[PDB]
Design a protein around this nucleic acid. Structure first.
Ligand SMILES: [Zn+2]
Ligand SMILES: [Zn+2]
Ligand SMILES: [Zn+2]
Ligand SMILES: [Zn+2]
Lengths: 82, 96, 69, 104, 93, 96, 78, 105, 94, 69
DNA sequence: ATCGGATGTATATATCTGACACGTGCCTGGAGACTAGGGAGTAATCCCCTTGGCGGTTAAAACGCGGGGGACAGCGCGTACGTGCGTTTAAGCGGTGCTAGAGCTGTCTACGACCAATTGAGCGGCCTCGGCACCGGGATTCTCGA
DNA sequence: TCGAGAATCCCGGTGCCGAGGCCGCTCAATTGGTCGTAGACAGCTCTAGCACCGCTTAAACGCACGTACGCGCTGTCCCCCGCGTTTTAACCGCCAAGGGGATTACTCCCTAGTCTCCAGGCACGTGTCAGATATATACATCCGAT
């Protein structure tokens, strides 16, 4: 098994997204707060892809299960065969 | 010793990163995270490359769109620095 | 002696939660007044069981009051 | 033997739309004039967005249409932005803007 | 086997507005998904709207009003006119 | 004579209206407003009573749900008075 | 018209919401906010009542128009 | 001749659900034991809310449920509040709550 | 003419949990409209699952995996456990 | 062995009212979670002793709740 | 405000490849032609429900004045964050190997659509009395200037 | 600190109209066969997802230093809350007229269904040129000394 891989999202990686967002100054206690928001968005999406991928008797996640899961939450995504 | 004023360099990175379209997180570190999370619902599972790429393409948009709205709550309170109490308010007003 | 132990055993049943028999009685229900431990009570609230184990009266989360000693 | 789409004068296929609409479990029966009406609306929207995308590509001295031009054309127009509200385009990007108070 | 798409029709339309430009394969998939989403959520409103009135057929009138409930403002006023102008030609011939 | 400190009456009436359940806006002027608004789409229309009642209920719910979101962003600026800029910020964040 | 939504009526809604102090410019802002929402609901209600060749807008049309906007309403049937 | 609901030990009607599934343009064919699975779910959800509302109908010294008691049942529990997240119950009201900064010292 | 509703079944369910408790007309009209809303969502989600896998019948599996997709968290466990216990009783009956 | 004698006395003082040492802890206070006996509660209300002894706070008529065991 | 030095951002010309645009074979899905039956268009009618008008109470809205708390502006201090540099770590790219699982094909059997005959369950109409609405009196609690 | 005053709650009595039960009666759910296609199962092919290794080298990391900004404090003043008096029209009860919503017959023509035929859209193969990459050059910009 693999553990504590949440620390792969580094401080420069988080700050680069904020730069694109538009902010100018970033407080110290933002990185830990942000790492806890991405870890929750990735459970809701994946728990539906896994539900889709086992009702079809398969044991490999495809690129269509993710699109369906994203569509079920009002987040439709164009470009991957939807 | 030619230094810059504290903020003129950060004001240029916004222009640099609002003009290019590319992924901002490292592919292998992001891909390991998905495999770690998705081993609790069902063990010994497999992924396509496109599934991981599509999962990464949406988190970027989500985080970027979230960092745009937390920058308005900081402006509302007469600030330029964004504190953790802005992310909570922005996330609570839209219901999540 | 046995009587000394019996009173020790008798009082032991009064301090510990009957469900757990491991922690002091800490949590009480307003509706019935019965006192149990905080830990055993919460897991019941997540199991969708809102009936008192003793008096069977229905209750809700807000009816939970902490006690001391 | 003439095609059903050339009679109407469209570029989109009428028969394919008819059989897709008659096999998707929408209604028990499908009228004759419904595919002709529906295939003429699908053609207008795509041209509407594909003209703006072409103009955006032309303003950048390019001669193709990469996904960035689609995002620019969609986000620069009010009605199109409202229609495509909660949808994300892969490799799209973001519309350049900076808060007025942040500048010196 | 095979699989169907709107690639040829989208290209044919593109060579009408801008006769000298092209399009990349990655944007082609986006254009192919957009027309599948719009057609899916326009024809999903007509079936439900015909169920309210205890009907059994979806005709052109059920689509003319289903377009008016989705497209905002100026877009609908053009889509309705262009859809109506196409049925008249078809009926005559 | 006898007076009350500014705020006590406000708190008691807050406590009062959050325990009742009837409609807050008068009925006849609202009916007139609906009949006037509907005139610009198709003249010579008629309304059932239940339609007007449903419209009133929906409007009350929407306005009540919005006034309790503008208050939450009024406090964020260390202030205790709601303002049009607070309303505008709440509406912008919600995603109108 | 829009002047029937009086200041005490507006302030009672704010009291139910839970505010304690109200600036003097709020009422003009809120009237123009309510007028926009009513138009959005009524236009769809009228389209629904006009598709069926009727002349009276009924409660079910209002319920459907509210439902398709992401705001369902229990208590009026359907 | 018994009824299918009685044979399955339920309270809700199975035949009506079976007919509603068929006359709804959901699929070409409907399985045998699909209504007996769908009717056992519609009843548990109803029994949950009708049990959570009877406590509110009693804490106010009443003996007849009114919409206000249903309003307080689906707002004091996360599971049901997250399911009915965009529903406005008529004649419901709001939930008593005052911000802690507004109170006097 | 005739009009159909679950008002007779909701009342039968109510008298199993609270033996002596009534219910008013508005509350009945709300409880009636809630069941239809849930029913229209479950079947509507189950149809797309059948369409996705190029199938044509809505059997008991699609209902199970559609319940596990809409109800949040801990409710789904109880709903599945209550459905799969009624089905097995039905199939082994008279 | 005095080892378990102290536990019983520790158990005894926990359940006995710390005021009278003659009655069980059967009348608790809702405001701060302390528990005493009903004997030592109403005597204080005679002189309007709204201040609790342990943490020393005020109370009321609805802040006294009956508890069992 | 006025120059000046340095830094990062456009601007112009090779070169070079991998993806876009075009051409051909072939097969299956779309176009023609005819038939039967049921959904839908049209006319009549009747009776519920919507609109309009009138008079009395009185509850809520409008207007004015006093003053005290809260919004806002200006100052000062010190800690937290931006910028730059040297060192270290792991990502990205290429190449090879092996095998578990997706995708397609052929059988055939059990399950769901469909139709004729029964009967009992659920719906419409009526009665009735008890739970809740309302009003009048005390008893307790909450606030503010001493 | 606590008494005067105002708001709020607990209790008792009276009345009324809507929930709860009852009965008769259609018509929809239940039995009982029959048949034909969807789908479960076994087998085969092949591809793409996983594991490992070696080599740059781009980027993550730790540290020093300075300063712009967040936060707490103080002061003036103006605008929103509380309360009393006067003017308005909302609400309730009553009455009457007619419009159109819902229901029932009757017919007719438009869509599903079947068989035949063939051209259009799809898979596969190939040339070639639009843009990515590198490099030298012109210039807008910024922070400092004055
Ligand atoms: Zn315990
Ligand atoms: Zn108990
Ligand atoms: Zn004592
Ligand atoms: Zn205490």
């Amino acid at each position: 098994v693999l553990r504590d891989n949440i620390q792969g999202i580094t401080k420069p990686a988080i700050r680069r997204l904020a730069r694109r967002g538009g902010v100018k100054r970033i407080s110290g206690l933002i990185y830990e707060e942000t790492r806890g928001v991405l870890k929750v968005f990735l459970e809701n999406v994946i728990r539906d892809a896994v539900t889709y991928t086992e009702h079809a008797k398969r044991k490999t996640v495809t690129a269509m299960d993710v699109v369906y899961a994203l569509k079920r939450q009002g987040r439709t995504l164009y470009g991957f065969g939807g | 010793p030619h230094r810059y004023r504290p903020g003129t360099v950060a004001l240029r990175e916004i222009r640099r990163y609002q003009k290019s379209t590319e992924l901002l997180i490292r592919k292998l570190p992001f891909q390991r995270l998905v495999r770690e999370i998705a081993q609790d619902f069902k063990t010994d599972l497999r992924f396509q490359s496109s599934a991981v790429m599509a999962l990464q393409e949406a988190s970027e948009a989500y985080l970027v769109a979230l960092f745009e709205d937390t920058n308005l709550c900081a402006i509302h309170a007469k600030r330029v620095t964004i504190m953790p109490k802005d992310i909570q308010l922005a996330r609570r007003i839209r219901g999540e | 002696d046995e009587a000394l132990v019996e009173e020790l055993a008798n009082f032991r049943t009064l301090v510990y939660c009957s469900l757990c028999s491991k922690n002091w009685k800490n949590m009480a229900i307003k509706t019935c007044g019965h006192v149990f431990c905080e830990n055993c009570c919460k897991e019941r609230l997540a199991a969708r069981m809102r009936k008192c184990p003793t008096c069977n009266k229905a209750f809700s989360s807000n009816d939970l009051l902490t006690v001391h000693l | 033997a003439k095609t059903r789409s050339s009679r109407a004068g469209l570029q989109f296929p009428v028969g394919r739309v008819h059989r897709l609409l008659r096999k998707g479990n929408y209604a028990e029966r499908v009228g004759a004039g419904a595919p002709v009406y529906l295939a003429a609306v699908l053609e207008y929207l795509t041209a509407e967005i594909l003209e703006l995308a072409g103009n955006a590509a032309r303003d950048n001295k390019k001669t193709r249409i990469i996904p960035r031009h689609l995002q620019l054309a969609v986000r620069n127009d009010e009605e199109l932005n409202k229609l495509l509200g909660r949808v994300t385009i892969a490799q799209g990007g973001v519309l350049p803007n900076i808060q007025s108070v942040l500048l010196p | 086997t095979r699989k169907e798409s709107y690639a040829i029709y989208v290209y044919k339309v593109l060579k009408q507005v801008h006769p000298d430009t092209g399009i990349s394969s990655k944007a082609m998939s986006i254009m192919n998904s957009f027309v599948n989403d719009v057609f899916e959520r326009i024809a999903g409103e007509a079936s439900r709207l015909a169920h309210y009135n205890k009907r059994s057929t979806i005709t052109s009138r059920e689509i003319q009003t289903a377009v008016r409930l989705l497209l905002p403002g100026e877009l609908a006023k053009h889509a309705v006119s262009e859809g109506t102008k196409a049925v008249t030609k078809y009926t005559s011939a």
